[PDB]
Amino acid sequence: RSNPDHEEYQYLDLIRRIINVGEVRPDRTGTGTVALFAPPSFRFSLADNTLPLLTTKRVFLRGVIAELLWFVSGCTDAKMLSSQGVGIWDGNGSKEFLEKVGLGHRREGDLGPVYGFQWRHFGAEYTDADGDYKGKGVDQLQRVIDTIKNNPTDRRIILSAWNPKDLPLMALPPCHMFCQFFVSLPPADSPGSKPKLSCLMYQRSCDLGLGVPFNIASYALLTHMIALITDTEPHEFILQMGDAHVYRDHVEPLKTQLEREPRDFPKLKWARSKEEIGDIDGFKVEDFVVEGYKPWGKIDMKMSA
Amino acid sequence: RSNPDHEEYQYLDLIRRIINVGEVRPDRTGTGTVALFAPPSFRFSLADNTLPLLTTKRVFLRGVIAELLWFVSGCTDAKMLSSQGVGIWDGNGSKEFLEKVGLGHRREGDLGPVYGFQWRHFGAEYTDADGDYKGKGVDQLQRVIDTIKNNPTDRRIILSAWNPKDLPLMALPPCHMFCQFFVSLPPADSPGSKPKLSCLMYQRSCDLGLGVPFNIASYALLTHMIALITDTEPHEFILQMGDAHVYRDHVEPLKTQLEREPRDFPKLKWARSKEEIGDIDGFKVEDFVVEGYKPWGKIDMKMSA
Numbered sequence: 001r002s003n004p005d006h007e008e009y010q011y012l013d014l015i016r017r018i019i020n021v022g023e024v025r026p027d028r029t030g031t032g033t034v035a036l037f038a039p040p041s042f043r044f045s046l047a048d049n050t051l052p053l054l055t056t057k058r059v060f061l062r063g064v065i066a067e068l069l070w071f072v073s074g075c076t077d078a079k080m081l082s083s084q085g086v087g088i089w090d091g092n093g094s095k096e097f098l099e100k101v102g103l104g105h106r107r108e109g110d111l112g113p114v115y116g117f118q119w120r121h122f123g124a125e126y127t128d129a130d131g132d133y134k135g136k137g138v139d140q141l142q143r144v145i146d147t148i149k150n151n152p153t154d155r156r157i158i159l160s161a162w163n164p165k166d167l168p169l170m171a172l173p174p175c176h177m178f179c180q181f182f183v184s185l186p187p188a189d190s191p192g193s194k195p196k197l198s199c200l201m202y203q204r205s206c207d208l209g210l211g212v213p214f215n216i217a218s219y220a221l222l223t224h225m226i227a228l229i230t231d232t233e234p235h236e237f238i239l240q241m242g243d244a245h246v247y248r249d250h251v252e253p254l255k256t257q258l259e260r261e262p263r264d265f266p267k268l269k270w271a272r273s274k275e276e277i278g279d280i281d282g283f284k285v286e287d288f289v290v291e292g293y294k295p296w297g298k299i300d301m302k303m304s305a
Numbered sequence: 306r307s308n309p310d311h312e313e314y315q316y317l318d319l320i321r322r323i324i325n326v327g328e329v330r331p332d333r334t335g336t337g338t339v340a341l342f343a344p345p346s347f348r349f350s351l352a353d354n355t356l357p358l359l360t361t362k363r364v365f366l367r368g369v370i371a372e373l374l375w376f377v378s379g380c381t382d383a384k385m386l387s388s389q390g391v392g393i394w395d396g397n398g399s400k401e402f403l404e405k406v407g408l409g410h411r412r413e414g415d416l417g418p419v420y421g422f423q424w425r426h427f428g429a430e431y432t433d434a435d436g437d438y439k440g441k442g443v444d445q446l447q448r449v450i451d452t453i454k455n456n457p458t459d460r461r462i463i464l465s466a467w468n469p470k471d472l473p474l475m476a477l478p479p480c481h482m483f484c485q486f487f488v489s490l491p492p493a494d495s496p497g498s499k500p501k502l503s504c505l506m507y508q509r510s511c512d513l514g515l516g517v518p519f520n521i522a523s524y525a526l527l528t529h530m531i532a533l534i535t536d537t538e539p540h541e542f543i544l545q546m547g548d549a550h551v552y553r554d555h556v557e558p559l560k561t562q563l564e565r566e567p568r569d570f571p572k573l574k575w576a577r578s579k580e581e582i583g584d585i586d587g588f589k590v591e592d593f594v595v596e597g598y599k600p601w602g603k604i605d606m607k608m609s610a
């Protein structure tokens with residue numbers, strides 16, 4: 001390894017380990033997987049505007065950003081993603097899947113009270129994706145922003161989408177069920193510096209081939225976004241996994257990826273200022289300027305619904 | 306070290322690290338702490354009836370068991386613990402503290418919809434600790450039991466007390482906010498063996514001196530309990546921490562503990578059979594037979610309310 005310390009090796013090494021000593025298991029989708037439970041967590045530095053966007057394969061960056069802004073908006077209609085050319089949620093939002101999980105009364109694309117809804121309206125009563133939820137439920141995301149700015153040492157800076165009561169209304173239960181932010185105060189020797197912002201996310205189920213690449217970049221981006229609005233400096237992103245698995249039909253495609261040497265991670269820059277963006281709800285896809293992204297070729301992998 | 310691989314060194318080493326390079330910070334209690342965010346997780350083997358009850362200091366075992374059976378029962382009245390000689394929750398259940406956090410309308414000891422209530426009645430409306438919640442809300446615990454027995458490869462075996470909507474009603478927000486169970490199927494070379502049960506718990510805020518010792522034994526015991534009811538074999542317990550800290554007034558007392566060499570962990574045996582206990586709600590303090598516990602002397606540490 002030209003550069004053995006490249007953070008991407010964490011991802012490649014775990015996949016190799018799962019394939020090697022993982023346990024073959026049946027699963028909800030019916031395709032089957034090989035898995036390990038609670039492996040060591042991943043750590044990615046977010047310093048110097050670094051964005052841990054995997055380079056051993058081309059990652060659909062725009063899809064990650066679109067999905068993230070979608071979460072932030074509190075929207076749960078997958079059509080808002082497919083209309084802009086992002087179909088990652090088309091599979092679980094299809095009329096065929098919804099009816100399959102007992103949600104036939106919903107129009108196609110209406111995923112239910114998933115991620116975004118819990119993030120901005122936790123506890124509110126869900127009708128459909130067109131419902132008026134403004135000012136209803138708990139806005140966890142804004143509370144996180146307010147807390148980081150006015151009481152950084154607080155120990156409850158949590159953002160969670162897990163809701164046992166709403167689960168049956170969801171086309172799919174949250175995979176990244178929650179994350180915790182931490183703010184390091186400016187060192188004594190130089191109190192003018194910006195506090196450092198870190199994020200730990202826990203993912204109950206992890207599709208290493210398809211999902212993890214998105215999850216890693218997504219939460220890294222969320223932390224960068226929150227850092228901008230709170231005048232803090234992104235520091236570290238930690239990802240703890242529960243059921244970490246590699247789908248059976250992903251094994252061969254991933255072996256090809258395992259042969260590739262990572263390129264230095266790209267950097268993130270903002271196309272607009274903090275003032276122009278305003279708050280967490282003012283970001284736009286075009287605001288994300290990712291430079292230096294130099295990935296290898298794309299690797300085709302089918303998603304199991 | 307006579308036994309460098311003793312699992313208790315994970316706990317001792319982390320405390321040493323926090324004291325050495327941890328960051329000095331202000332906190333809600335006002336006593337102050339030294340902390341590190343998201344340190345490597347702890348792993349404890351639960352095989353061969355092993356119970357990771359710390360030995361470098363005498364741990365109030367009966368108090369751990371009592372609190373756990375209290376959680377399971379869904380009860381939120383701290384008087385149910387103090388009446389049996391366990392006052393770990395007297396501090397946050399006292400009238401002064403309750404009135405202090407805006408809950409003066411509650412009788413002393415009524416902590417609100419904390420741990421146990423969320424575990425067995427998530428989503429139900431909370432009135433007071435005497436309310437009738439039977440059959441109300443989501444019983445996450447029993448669902449976990451049923452899932453382990455009938456669909457072990459499920460990836461949603463989650464037990465969580467985090468409830469953004471109910472937080473303000475709680476004397477204190479959940480520290481151990483959730484855990485995930487995992488079941489390994491019997492290997493091919495012996496399909497008669499019992500499936501192996503593991504548990505990963507995530508704790509947002511960790512008082513290493515006082516809380517962690519209880520948290521470790523508590524979730525280890527919970528896994529042993531669930532294993533009995535589900536005909537599975539306890540395997541491993543993983544603990545991931547968020548804000549890992551040592552209170553200022555615990556530093557000196559802990560230094561004394563750091564000088565001690567761990568004794569082999571004790572073992573857990575049941576005073577009754579699975580049939581006699583019946584289900585997760587049938588356990589009694591006397592059912593827990595811990596043998597071989599050989600700890601060093603107690604170490605006094607004050608809890609910051």
Ligand SMILES: C#CCN(Cc1ccc2[nH]c(N)nc(=O)c2c1)c1ccc(C(=O)N[C@@H](CCC(=O)O)C(=O)O)cc1
Nearest residue numbers: 060087088089207210211212214215299301303304305
């Ligand atoms: C995590 C997350 C968000 N999600 C949502 C989501 C929904 C159901 C899931 N189901 C399964 N089995 N695995 C998943 O990772 C998963 C993820 C994603 C969904 C699909 C892809 C995907 O198929 N990507 C392909 C094609 C990308 C493209 O459209 O160009 C890829 O090659 O990456 C990525 C992320």
Ligand SMILES: C#CCN(Cc1ccc2[nH]c(N)nc(=O)c2c1)c1ccc(C(=O)N[C@@H](CCC(=O)O)C(=O)O)cc1
Nearest residue numbers: 365392393394512515516517519520604606608609610
């Ligand atoms: C986690 C958890 C449950 N809890 C609940 C709970 C509630 C508020 C808290 N607040 C703070 N600052 N730290 C805590 O760990 C904490 C824990 C506990 C509460 C007290 C002790 C404690 O004082 N232990 C002393 C005395 C033991 C005894 O009563 O005999 C000790 O020496 O261990 C331990 C656990």
Ligand SMILES: *c1cc(=O)[nH]c(=O)n1[C@H]1C[C@H](O)[C@@H](COP(=O)(O)O)O1
Nearest residue numbers: 028173175176205206207211212460
């Ligand atoms: C879910 C969504 C996400 O953001 N990331 C993911 O990796 N996934 C994966 C996990 C799993 O393979 C599948 C969901 O299936 P299940 O609910 O765990 O049965 O999507």
Ligand SMILES: *c1cc(=O)[nH]c(=O)n1[C@H]1C[C@H](O)[C@@H](COP(=O)(O)O)O1
Nearest residue numbers: 155333478480481510511512516517
């Ligand atoms: C909370 C309860 C528990 O089970 N274990 C714990 O260690 N604690 C600790 C963490 C922290 O010191 C305090 C809770 O205060 P805060 O909500 O984190 O501000 O108790």
